[PDB]
């Protein structure tokens, strides 16, 4: 929604943001027709 703070008018529409790759049942992706796995990454946890 686009809001005009001065006028006070709201314009609402659904915009197409693209395509989200979908994970298959077994837990992989098909990227450009090729099966791919996103490997989990380990790193230092945030904090103090």
Partner DNA sequence: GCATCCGTGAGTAGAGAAGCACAATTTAACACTTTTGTCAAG
Partner DNA sequence: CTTGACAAAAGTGTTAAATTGTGCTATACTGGGAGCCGTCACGGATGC
Residues in contact with another protein by the rule CB under 8 A: 1-2, 4, 11-13, 15-21, 29, 31-32, 36, 38
Give the shortest CB-40-to-another protein separation in angstroms.
Answer: 13
Q: CB under 5 to 8 A by kind: which of another protein, DNA, none does 26 bind?
A: none
Structure tokens at 38: 């996103």
- At residue 28's C-alpha, the angle toward residues 15 and 45, to 5°, is 85
Give the shortest CB-27-to-another protein separation in angstroms.
Answer: 14
């Amino acid at each position: 929604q686009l809001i005009h703070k001065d006028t006070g008018l709201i314009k609402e529409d659904e915009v197409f943001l693209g395509h989200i790759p979908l994970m298959t049942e077994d837990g992989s992706f098909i990227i450009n027709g090729a099966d791919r796995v996103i490997v989990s990454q380990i790193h230092r946890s945030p904090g103090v």
